[PDB]
Symmetry: D2
Subunit: 260 residues, 4 copies
């Protein structure tokens, strides 16, 4: 079937990509990077992130697979020396799809822009004090002062969210998690402190207080947005699909990356 392979760009990953293409040449497999049905990423989680955003407009037709060339990633869970068995396994098919939730970010001006995040989306100010009003389902919840806020997907909770004190949530939970960055709390300023975990259909909305310029990130992309009236976070209707050939539980994946 149609497939394509993206590479981190170094000597190891490039020459690994060519050997898998040569293997696929021995099967009923067509290379096409315009309309692939299997997207193989060789490199790190950054390379996987690129592959995801490269094809984010055909998510329900693509199954992703990641190979990690030098670390072990959360999205790239195949060893380079296991690439041969991967070629064969894919060649037959009848494999299994597992799906992870994604985060939708909407930015409104005084035309509205929408983004999709697999890890997280963060907001900071463009230099100067970051102050925003936090609104949950049209109800005012708190006035946040600090360095910024981070809204994470389930599979992203092991990334930036973890460094901010957030909890690691299993990706079978359709949720999003908001964490604080160096929140100031005193007698006059008051934030919840704790990470918040929202279900599907809950809309968290950030609204400027004075400054209307914010540095907004979605995964690895970061843009300075001018004249912002609203940022809206919610769990996306879209999901990312993975091809799985073997049992590799999320908590096992958490164990191997952080314990030993």
């Amino acid at each position: 079937m149609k497939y394509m392979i993206t590479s981190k760009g170094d000597e190891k990953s490039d020459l690994l990509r060519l050997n898998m293409i040569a293997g696929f040449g021995e099967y009923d497999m067509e290379y096409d990077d315009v309309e692939p049905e299997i997207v193989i990423s060789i490199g790190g989680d950054g390379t996987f992130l690129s592959a995801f955003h490269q094809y984010e407009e055909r998510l329900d037709e693509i199954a992703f697979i990641g190979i990690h060339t030098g670390h072990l990633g959360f999205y790239a869970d195949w060893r380079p020396a296991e690439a041969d068995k991967l070629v064969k396994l894919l060649a037959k098919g009848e494999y299994q799809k597992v799906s992870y939730p994604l985060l939708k970010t909407t930015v409104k001006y005084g035309k509205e822009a929408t983004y999709l995040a697999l890890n997280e989306s963060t907001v900071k100010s463009s230099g100067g004090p970051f102050v925003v009003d936090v609104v949950i389902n049209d109800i005012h919840f708190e006035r946040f002062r600090g360095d910024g806020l981070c809204m994470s997907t389930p599979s992203g909770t092991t990334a930036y969210n973890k460094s901010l004190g957030g909890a690691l949530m299993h990706p079978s939970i359709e949720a999003m998690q908001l964490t604080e960055m160096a929140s100031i709390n005193n007698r006059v300023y008051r934030t919840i402190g704790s990470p918040l975990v929202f279900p599907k259909h809950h809309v968290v909305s950030l609204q400027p207080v004075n400054d209307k310029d914010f540095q907004i990130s979605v995964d690895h992309l970061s843009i300075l947005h001018r004249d912002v009236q609203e940022i809206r976070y919610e769990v996306s209707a879209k999901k990312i699909h993975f091809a799985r050939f073997r049992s590799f539980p999320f908590w096992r994946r958490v164990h191997d990356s952080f314990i030993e």
Copy 2:
């Protein structure tokens, strides 16, 4: 219909209970504390906890309601001066049921005991060092050293779980959250650090390393369990049901208790 009222025991709550009984005497309402269908609790969240555990063996036939006499509770969300409108509203019926998830705790010896928690269940040692192996779905995840562990329900995340750094999760999420207590981490000992959020059907299992005596709590109850071979945590099939007469969102309930 059948109903009963529990009271915190002070002058304010007792005399409030009698006036509601007198009001119910003017309607098609029968008082029965053996088989109630509505359980009204007057006092604090501790009084609500007692009412829950008092009737925990008929959960799918009971709708709980809480009145708070001096603070505002997470489970008790009616003011004392609003008791009259509560009597009328209940008297008709046709109200709405909303359900929150609960946590099942199983303790195995070398007969097994099961408990139900609405807030959380915690484990500490009976004096001396607390060391347990943490096993997630039959796979060894980590060896925990510290003061103890805390497994929280969704609605309990605003209680002990919050003081331990856990996240507040919306109660429409069928999940449980495990948090650490003063975990020791160095070059030789290694814990995940972060709170973990588990879905339904995931079994977290604590297993002793040396000492087999632990002080186990379920909500307000705390018992020293001798000769423990296993403690098992999982999201209960049982749920607690609340009668609701008005919109009072969880995040609004979080706002009022912690922000202003």
Copy 3:
């Protein structure tokens, strides 16, 4: 004696400044903003910070006093309605000097620049990943990956340092405290996690790993430093001197700002 008054710039602070000058006109007091011996600041801690950095090259000849017009500050500890008693008290003299420690920051290129901080000095990258080697007294301590680092004075521990998890240390301790910003920790990357408190004469040195451009802050000032070979932190030989007329303990000052 020689004195000057700086103002936040709003209607309240300006007209308060003029009335104190008019009061000082009734005493043996000369206004001079080139060589003052008493520096009065009217506004907030930001206004006090400006007054400090404005005269940071004559610290051992100046005693600072702060008046707060709308909050209560840590450095500005006099109420606007107490300004009259302040004028009289200053006019006699024979008051007391109390001194707080300061932080020296040195930045070396491949000419070296030195700065003085009353609150703290922070380091972040100029976009992209922040990676530095942390060296304590010429010995390599750790490789830090995250958002940045913050080195705080004693009196600054209640500012940014507090929001990063640092401890509040009494200003009679000649020390500096380093705190982490969203440090990444996994199986391969390893930071101490905890805040570190250094005595006089200990030199903490940050050294770039790849990128040599950092956004460095000293109190309110923030500059992008190009081609950085070393940043050096140590407790300054210089100290800031305050005129005190009444007992107002630091822990009382902490209490009023954060408890009630």
Copy 4:
């Protein structure tokens, strides 16, 4: 000179102790465990703690040395295979004394008891809610609700204090650090949150609110104190003295125990 050796009790430490005694038999060294001038501890930091408390009433006449048999300790900083060079080095003398500060704990009833801590002293309730008023230099600072409080020496900050979020402070700083255990914070209850670092001569005083029974620990000892009116913490006039033969900086000692 007079010396004695304490041992962890296992086969490795006992037979190591006998060989050093046999070595000392070849020098001008007298074994005496009633009035030693050098106290050698073989085992772990727990064994060192015992040796310290065993001789805590002759601190200014004793220099401690620690050997670690199976880990590496903060107080025991000599390898078992380096014991021979230790015997020789001690035998001459003219070595160097370095001193670390200690914490004094006073417990008053309605006769007062005083204790000395090298690591820390903690307070919890004897089951039930822990509520105490925190008073700093006779001024009321906060009402603490939670699991307990921990007051740490400088060298103890790498022990329990570290697991509670405290900062690691260099032992040349005559200070003590207080950290919180699972403090409850909401709209009505309010704690500082942050660790507090106190200088010499500052007295922190805990006072019961309702319950007067507390479980008080000093290092490894833990006693249930009945009818408590006051607990007083302050930096002790006494100090512990170490014999040093080589440079082994505290931050190097921190590095080796937590980084690699």
